[PDB]
UniProtKB/TrEMBL annotation:
Pfam families: Ost4 (PF10215). This is Oligosaccharyltransferase. The lineage of its organism: Eukaryota, Fungi, Dikarya, Ascomycota, Saccharomycotina. It is a single-pass type III membrane protein. InterPro entries: Oligosaccaryltransferase, Ost4p_sf. The chain crosses the membrane at residues 7-28.
Length: 39
């Protein structure tokens, strides 16, 4: 039994956190192993 409040907070939290993790991992991975893919 979850409440709209808990669900909303859990959603925004998971989103922001996930974005940060992927953001860093992406920037680092790209900086270490970049590529010439752009058009």
């Amino acid at each position: 039994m979850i409440s709209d409040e808990q669900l909303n907070s859990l959603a925004i939290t998971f989103g922001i956190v996930m974005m940060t993790l992927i953001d860093i991992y992406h920037a680092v991975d790209s900086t270490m192993s970049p590529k010439n893919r752009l058009e």
